[PDB]
UniProtKB/Swiss-Prot annotation, chains A, B:
Disulfide bonds join 49-114, 62-94, 63-96, 68-78, 259-271, 301-376, 306-380, 328-370. Residues 84-101 are annotated as: E1 fusion peptide loop. Interacts with spike glycoprotein E2. The precursor of protein E3/E2 and E1 form a heterodimer shortly after synthesis. Processing of the precursor of protein E3/E2 into E2 and E3 results in a heterodimer of the spike glycoproteins E2 and E1. Spike at virion surface are constituted of three E2-E1 heterodimers. After target cell attachment and endocytosis, E1 change conformation to form homotrimers. Interacts with 6K protein. Residues 13-408 are extracellular. It is found in: Virion membrane; Host cell membrane. N-glycosylated. Class II viral fusion protein. Fusion activity is inactive as long as E1 is bound to E2 in mature virion. After virus attachment to target cell receptor PCDH10 and endocytosis, acidification of the endosome induce dissociation of E1/E2 heterodimer and concomitant trimerization of the E1 subunits. This E1 trimer is fusion active, and promotes release of viral nucleocapsid in cytoplasm after endosome and viral membrane fusion. Efficient fusion requires the presence of cholesterol and sphingolipid in the target membrane. It is a single-pass type I membrane protein. This is Spike glycoprotein E1. It comes from Western equine encephalitis virus (WEEV). It comes from the Viruses. The chain holds residues 798 to 1208 of 1236 of the full protein. Glycans are attached at residues 139, 245, 270.
Swiss-Prot record, chain E:
Changing residue 27 to A: Complete loss of entry of Semliki virus into the cell. It is found in: Cell membrane; Membrane, Clathrin-coated pit. Residues 1-41, 42-82 form the LDL-receptor class A domain. It comes from Homo sapiens. The chain holds residues 70 to 151 of 873 of the full protein. Disulfide bonds join 3-15, 10-28, 22-39, 44-58, 51-71, 65-80. This is Very low-density lipoprotein receptor. The gene is VLDLR.
Amino acid sequence: FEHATTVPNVPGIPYKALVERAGYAPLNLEITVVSSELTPSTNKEYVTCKFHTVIPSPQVKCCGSLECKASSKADYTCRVFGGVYPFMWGGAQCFCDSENTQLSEAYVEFAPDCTIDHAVALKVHTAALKVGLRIVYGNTTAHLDTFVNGVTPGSSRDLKVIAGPISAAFSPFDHKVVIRKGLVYNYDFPEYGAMKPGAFGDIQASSLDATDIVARTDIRLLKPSVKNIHVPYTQAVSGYEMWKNNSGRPLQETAPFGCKIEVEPLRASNCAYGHIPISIDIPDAAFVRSSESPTILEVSCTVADCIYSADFGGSLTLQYKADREGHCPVHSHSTTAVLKEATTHVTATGSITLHFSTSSPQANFIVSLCGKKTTCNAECKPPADHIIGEPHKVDQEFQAAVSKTSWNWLL
Amino acid sequence: FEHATTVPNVPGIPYKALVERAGYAPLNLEITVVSSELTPSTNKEYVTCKFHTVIPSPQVKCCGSLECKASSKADYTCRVFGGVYPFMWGGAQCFCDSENTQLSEAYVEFAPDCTIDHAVALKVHTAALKVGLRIVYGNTTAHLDTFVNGVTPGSSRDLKVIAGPISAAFSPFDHKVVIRKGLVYNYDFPEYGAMKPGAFGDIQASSLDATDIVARTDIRLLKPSVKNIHVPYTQAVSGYEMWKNNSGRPLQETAPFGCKIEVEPLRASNCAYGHIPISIDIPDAAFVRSSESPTILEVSCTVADCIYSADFGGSLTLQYKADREGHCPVHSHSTTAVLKEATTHVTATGSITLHFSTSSPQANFIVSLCGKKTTCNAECKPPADHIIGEPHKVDQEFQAAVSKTSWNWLL
Amino acid sequence: ITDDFTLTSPYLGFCPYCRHSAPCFSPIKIENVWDESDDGSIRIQVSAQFGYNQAGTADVTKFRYMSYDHDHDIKEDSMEKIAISTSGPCRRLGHKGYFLLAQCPPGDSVTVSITSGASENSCTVEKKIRRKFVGREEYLFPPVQGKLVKCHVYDRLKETSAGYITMHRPGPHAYKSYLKEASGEVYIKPPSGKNVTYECKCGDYSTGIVSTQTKMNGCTKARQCIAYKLDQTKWVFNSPDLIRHTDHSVQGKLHIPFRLTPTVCPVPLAHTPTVTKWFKGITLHLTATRPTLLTTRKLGLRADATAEWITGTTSRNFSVGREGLEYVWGNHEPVRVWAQESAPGDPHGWPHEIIIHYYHRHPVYTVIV
Amino acid sequence: ITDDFTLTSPYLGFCPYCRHSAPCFSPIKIENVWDESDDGSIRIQVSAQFGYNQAGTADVTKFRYMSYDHDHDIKEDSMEKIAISTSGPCRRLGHKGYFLLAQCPPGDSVTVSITSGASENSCTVEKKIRRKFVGREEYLFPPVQGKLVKCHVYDRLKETSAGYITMHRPGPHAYKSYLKEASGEVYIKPPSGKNVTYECKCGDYSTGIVSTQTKMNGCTKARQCIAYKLDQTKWVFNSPDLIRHTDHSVQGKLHIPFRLTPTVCPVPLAHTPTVTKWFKGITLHLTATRPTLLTTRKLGLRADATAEWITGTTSRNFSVGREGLEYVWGNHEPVRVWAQESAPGDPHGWPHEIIIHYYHRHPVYTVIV
Amino acid sequence: KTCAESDFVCNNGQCVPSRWKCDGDPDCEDGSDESPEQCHMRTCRIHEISCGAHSTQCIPVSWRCDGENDCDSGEDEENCGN
Ligand SMILES: [Ca+2]
Ligand SMILES: [Ca+2]
């Protein structure tokens, strides 16, 4: 028998519910979320690191014509000079005076040790949402995982749970996102093939060891004017390091709703937002006829001093007279008063002590114990301590938050 | 023969007065104060300095367990950790695995070098006053140092003086004062017993050599996880050092009225404020009757130039004639004019020159040569030099600081 | 890749400094310096092969020298004479071929020099090496006990491949001491037993290989003629300070040792703060003797994260609402704090306390109503 | 309190930073560094007794330290191998027992090291050392001529005492080399000519005293049984890296040398200010090449004191009333200045310019009248 | 539970930090942390000398010519001075 329900997406805290069918004993139902990671569909386009400029030994021709060719090396640059005189340890390298020519050469490559701090550029879209559920009902536990889309059910061995579409929708990742050393940033890198000198993506490559490196660092050679031989060069500041200097706060400490971003599959696990509705089909085997559930007469509810706080402040007690031994689920039919325990053992004429966590100044909520419904009204004070490390159980709802005394004072 | 007067409380500046009787020539009576201390009563309660934590060697019991009982030593924090395997230069210090515990403890005691750097906390009240003043009467000099209440007298060689209560009473010290290294601050330290970590008074003790001291520095012990044996601990920043860093200006350079402050008895000496009334009696041995005192008549005034300032600016000349040669005191009855000289040698038809100072634009003041009064007036110009190192000998008064020309103009 | 080391030779370089602080030709010229380790280590590449004998028989405590004088050969000296420094003397952790490891205090220049011997030389290059820490909570010495975090240190073991460096065939190496200016003619001379390859152009281009003092065809000035040795074939590094050969193709590939290897390392933990709780707020009595980081962020629809390196013993006032607030402090785990609705007054009894209670919470909904 | 050093012994500490930049067990471990002097003197306390031979007969040029060998005995070394350094080398000033005094420029860490050839260690701790001056007018070196104030400086004489140190019974010290794992069982092997005691829970708790190798019953692993020696009786300090005895009572005391004493002390005098006089004010013309403090205050009921460190050549303007002010520049004695009335205009002016003189004085009280 | 990837795995599965591996000190129950299989070795430690040149047994250097054998062979009580 299916049972439509709406469950808030707040991992860790439960959501009590009661499912009832005519001619059948009521069954307790609780739904708890233990993990919820949203995994965007990524697509790498290039990686980058700090370029290491290499300058090959300059070739000189003793007064003969010289000119280079065009190669596929990254940021290749030729400059031919006329009227030089190189001086090595044994001086006068060329025999020919004021007519020899030398040509420079410079091309960039990935640093030998940049295999450990390479920055990966990613493009992400269409953020899904996968949740690991945990549901129990009538003394049996079920552990399962399912998606959030409205079609595919994450099936257990016996269960069939269809998690409906989630009302709210957001993604902490922007359109473009970079990755380095396990920290997930939020940048807008230049696209492939369009570099900018001194900014991020100064040197591009499809893979770490790939030979198709493309870079632009606007190197410009200079005509040597020193007695000995050395090829001078001027280079723009490294772009990746410059980005690293003022990288800013990573998304691990900036994403809203409390998501903690993992790096290996680029997850956003364990954060709370919105309401995810589900449709659970309970197998018929779990139910039981109404002739087996204990019957109870004269159920009365007395309320001890409570506090509407995150923790289980409110106390409860019941008086009854049953006819046979058994265990009877308990649950309250109010949307702003969550109980503590579902199954309880019922003796002939005993008393049960409960706990609950209200969010309303007055406790006008109906408690349903094994089918019998009772109402009890009370009045209790705000909490004393005003900082807790436990998230709240219910919402304000802006209706029951106003006391009965204030209500009859206004009206 | 008693006389009542009020000497202004300004050390170093004498003021001139006379006494008149029946058939007795007036005699000079000037009162001056050389020193005046202001000692308030103190009540030391504790002395503090920077601590030095002494962490005893940890205790380990092999294949067993132990408990630690608290002691009375200052901030004795103790813990026990179960399942440790201590190591040192010779490994395997315990013949037991995950069953032998260790004992970690720490306390606080006075530094071995703070016997000079200690800060003493005081609490002062009922600031009394004593003054040592010089009296010259009849060309006779006496030195007395009496109190300020109108009860205790000061007697030396038939010289009785009574000092009345001061017109205005204050103290340069606040309720709570603190002393270190011979200079006094002005701080509000916590009461003896309520310490706060990281602030002044982190350690309290009756004396630097006391046995039982009390302090709290929130010593908290971490869990040992290193391979060898060593106790971990974290502590708050030493409060005394922080206060020394953020002390502020000492009271030596903040006390008003110029009270330079000593530190051995916690005095406050040599400053000027208010008026102190004085009653003094003179024995008749210094009194001369009118029979032997030369009688002076036909007094006259003329002055070369008068200029009002702090020092003796104006110059006054006197013309007279008498019957006998001797000594005749000269005095100015006006409160805005004083005479530098005290006694003069009078002749038959001589002429003496006198120095006077005045704070009024008009030098309209009378003088009394052996009781013979006469008018004396002139116009005085403002001084060119507006910065000097001598306090003004007279105070500004109304109906005198206004020039006669302007007085006529507004009338 | 290649690992045999008997057919490569060191070379001279134009060191920007020297012993006398001048542009100098030294056999200890250095090309690159790397400081990408979280330990302070440094990999230095020099122009004098370390840890190898004259013939390359892989001796631990010998290194090639490439002497100054003409008829240049490769000699060796004891390894104890080597010593590198940045601002003060610093230790050495390994050596292999051109590269030698290091660990030096922060400074502004890197120096490698030979201490004693017949010739003393040095080489300094401007490179800003500054102290770096791991994670947060800047420290100065690694603590005895602390949290373990993932580091990245160089591997001091020599047999760890990190990269790819090339060599090339040696180029011409001219010498001035092979020419004589005695009279109106040019004389050349080779060393004892060596066959130089003289060649120069005055009148027309010419070459040749000789063994003793050889006459010229006829030509006045010997400055314009050159000569070099041809009996050399040892590979050299692709340095920017050598004459390129005619072909200049890659001959052999050898390794750059000391691969950067991930590992663990301890980091200090701060002093745990003391928390004071006030209505819809929180105050932290933080304390740290060295720069430590404190980051907060809300759990609602807006984050407005804050990061500030606090250094003293301060007190910060944070605002926490119904949604929540998480904060980290140093290397500690994140901790979450949720605020409830507890305002002064009472929602019963009298209206004058009901309005007080309802004013602090939602201070605009009660006003309009 | 005792002064004989034949009843004590050194101990092995755990220095956080040895020479090879790693936690280590060292004999030259230092515990505290006191920096409450006024000339830069430092009282370092280490874990090795100085000024005594092996038996402790008060020899100037000898010092003790425990040996790394397993038959741990106190050994000897020459005194001139001990060096102190923070940033540059420190110059030693004395030594007695654990302690030794030094003096050297500020840095960020204090190190002592044995620079011998056999055993060479270098402990190091993190201590913030900053240079301290006395009084005002911050200086670098004590000037030759100046006023004399009260400094507080450690005295080099070792016969003084300011402190109270304790020693306790030396705790157990087990060695892993006293066990064997020959075939299946354990062999407890004492050293040559000495007695060791073994306490173990091999099967059940047991103990025994022997001086020669024996065979245990029911043992299968070497680790399970540990044997230590019983020849340790000399008193040892209660450092937090040792193991306390079963009682751990105070059983002797020694002095902390180099007490703090007052001493006459020089301090520079700043350049005398040049004063210019203007109506109801003062214009000081200051100058100073180093941070100098100038402080002023009034003589009336309200002090409005001001203190400010200046470092350049600047001028400050002050206002002086009828009651006057005092200013204390640098180290010089206080000087007091009183101001009088010198407003422009004759108080007996024939024209109506009587107001202007009565306007500067009493600016408000003359408008109404 | 699942052992951390940051810690070492013994033959017994005990999880210990990687620093304790290859330090000449048994930090794990079965001794696989210092076994020659998990750590490459040639020369012995400073305080231990190889014995027999066949079994490569290492014993403390103080165990020489003491009068008692400390090896599986008989090369322990010879070549020592008086
Ligand atoms: Ca190990
Ligand atoms: Ca033996």
